[PDB]
Every structure is written in structure tokens, then in C-alpha cells.
Amino acid sequence: SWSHPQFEKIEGRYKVTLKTPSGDKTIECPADTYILDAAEEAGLDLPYSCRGGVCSSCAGKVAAGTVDQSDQSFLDDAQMGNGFVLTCVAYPTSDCTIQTHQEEALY
Ligand code: FES
Numbered sequence: 001s002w003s004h005p006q007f008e009k010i011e012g013r014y015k016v017t018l019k020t021p022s023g024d025k026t027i028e029c030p031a032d033t034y035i036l037d038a039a040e041e042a043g044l045d046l047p048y049s050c051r052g053g054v055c056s057s058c059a060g061k062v063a064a065g066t067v068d069q070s071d072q073s074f075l076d077d078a079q080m081g082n083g084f085v086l087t088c089v090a091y092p093t094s095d096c097t098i099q100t101h102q103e104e105a106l107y
Pocket residue numbers: 047048049050051052053054055056057058059074086087088089
């Protein structure tokens with residue numbers, strides 16, 4: 001192996017502000033890391049079920065910034081156009097603010 005952590009995990013991280021029901025919590029999220037994975041590693045308890053982009057459990061809404069959720073399946077094109085994000089399969093592509101716990105907002 002290597003005598004250092006992976007550069008991709010130490011450097012170049014995006015700021016992700018999770019606007020949760022219990023307040024805003026800003027974490028660093030590597031570009032190669034799904035938002036849910038960074039949040040759960042940081043000790044947050046965000047909702048999820050399938051971890052595969054096929055449900056609404058981990059849904060959030062992008063309040064600021066952009067994501068890459070090319071692996072997602074469940075959201076329709078309009079929902080994604082309107083800012084919904086499946087946090088379990090979404091990489092940040094900018095500093096961003098994601099309101100969590102938005103499953104119920106989906107129609
Ligand atoms: S937990 Fe099912 S889509 Fe994210």
C-alpha cells in the first residue's frame with residue numbers, strides 16, 4: 001500500500017452544508033465521495049434505505065451548488081431539474097447546500 005492517505009480523500013474537498021431538521025452541519029466531501037457517505041462518516045444520521053439510487057429515502061434538495069447523480073434512477077427529469085437529489089448516489093461538483101429529509105416533498 002502507501003505511506004499516506006489517498007490524496008483524493010485529503011485534498012480538494014467540497015464544502016457541503018447539510019441543512020438538516022436539527023440545524024445546518026457543514027462537512028467536507030471529497031469529489032469522489034457520495035454526499036450520504038461523507039455525512040455518515042462524519043457521524044451524521046441521514047436517512048437512507050437502498051443505497052442504490054432506486055428509492056426516495058435519502059432524498060434532499062439542492063439549495064445551492066451542483067451535484068453529479070448520474071447513478072440515480074428514482075427521480076424523474078423534472079424532479080432533478082427542480083433540485084431534488086438522491087444523496088446516496090450524488091457526488092458534489094461544487095460547494096453546496098443540501099436540505100436533507102426531503103422524501104415527503106416528492107410528488
Ligand atoms: S437510499 Fe434509496 S435512493 Fe438513496
